[PDB]
Amino acid sequence: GTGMSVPEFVSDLDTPDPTIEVFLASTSDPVIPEEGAQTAGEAYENVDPVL
Amino acid sequence: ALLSFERKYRVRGGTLIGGDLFDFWVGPFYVGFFGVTTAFFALLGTILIFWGASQQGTFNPWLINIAPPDLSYGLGMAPLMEGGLWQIITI
Incomplete structure (x- = not known):
């Protein structure tokens, strides 16, 4: 009786955000570090945050 | 009771349905077939509104509220x- 509701067309509800698929095609699972693995700073000259 | 000029207009006929079975007056009001259906529907609706008010818990005319159902x-x-009750009263 309040009038509190949100209206939407069903053709619009069935259309996903079109960038969800772009993301899933550019993502990969992490690689668990092994025992005493070689880091990026001992292989190139980089910056502290990513070293 | 009639107005000073009303008696000559109170003739028989002109009904859509019912004939002279409901062709009369109660006080100033005219009743016909559709006067009997109006009375029934309106009285049922009002009585149901007040029964719903009794079950809600308040008889305050400002606060009586009978609401439609959920969207589900x-x-x-x-x-x-x-x-x-809202659906029945709407009918």
Whole structure:
């Protein structure tokens, strides 16, 4: 009786955000570090945050 | 009681349905077939409104509220306390 509701067309509800698929095609699972693995700073000259 | 000029207009005929079975007056009001259906429907609606008010818990004219059902019921019929009384009163 309040009038509190949100209206939407069903053709619009069935259309996903079109960038969800772009993301899933550019993502990969992490690689668990092994025992005493070689880091990026001992292989190139980089910056502290990513070293 | 009639107005000074009303008696000559109170003739018989001109009904859509019912003939002279309901062709009369109660006080100033004219009744016909559609006067009997109006009385029934209006009285039933008002009595149901006040029964719903009694079950709500308040008789204050400002605060009486009979509401439609939830959206999850769709176009079906709801239980009479959770919005079905509204449907009956609408009919």
